Design a binder for this molecule. Structure first.
Ligand SMILES: OC[C@H](CC1CCC1)Nc1ncnc2[nH]ccc12
Ligand SMILES: [Cl-]
Length: 167
């Protein structure tokens, strides 16, 4: 039993809800919130900009130190950093950004990072401003993640479309 509420169950382990991930994380304070990161951990827009804003820029400060020490992530890769006031940990995961010409096949590799954590709150990787088809992202999620994932989707028409089209 966990404290996630109001989710539709899609499979044994994948759940979905129309929600603002910032407001969800503040309520649940999950062990792991997933950020839709880029390789530079520059949290400007989309989910990343919203999560960072909610931390009063502390996420960006921590991220800049991480990059200065370690260099950029790989597309498809991840790192674990603090969750600040939102969660215990933030798993920064880099899905391919189609608006940059990155290979969509890397989306499966990106979702594989979720399997290192028993329970996660997360957005659909490569959706929104990353320019991929969200129906595809949900399909890859369901077919790749084996741990318990609670997907937040900050758009009603999209959410309704994702539910009604889910196979
Ligand atoms: O990338 C996945 C979705 C895509 C957008 C919804 C339609 C375009 N983004 C988000 N999902 C959940 N919570 C969020 N908070 C701020 C942004 C955000
Ligand atoms: Cl987005």
């Amino acid at each position: 039993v966990n404290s996630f509420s109001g989710y539709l169950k899609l499979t044994d382990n994948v759940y979905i809800k129309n929600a603002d991930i910032v407001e969800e994380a503040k309520k649940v304070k999950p062990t792991v919130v997933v950020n839709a990161a880029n390789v530079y951990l520059k949290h400007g827009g989309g989910v990343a900009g919203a999560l960072n804003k909610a931390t009063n820029n502390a996420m960006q400060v921590e991220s800049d130190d991480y990059i200065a020490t370690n260099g950029p992530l790989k597309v498809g890769g991840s790192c674990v950093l603090s969750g600040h006031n939102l969660a215990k940990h933030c798993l920064h995961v880099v899905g391919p950004n189609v608006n940059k010409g990155e290979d969509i096949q890397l989306l499966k590799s990106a979702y594989e990072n979720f399997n290192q954590h028993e329970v996660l709150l997360a957005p659909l990787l490569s959706a929104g401003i990353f320019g991929a088809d969200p129906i595809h992202s949900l399909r890859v999620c369901v077919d790749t993640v084996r741990t318990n994932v609670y997907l937040a989707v900050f758009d009603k028409n999209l959410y309704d479309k994702l539910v009604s089209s889910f196979l």
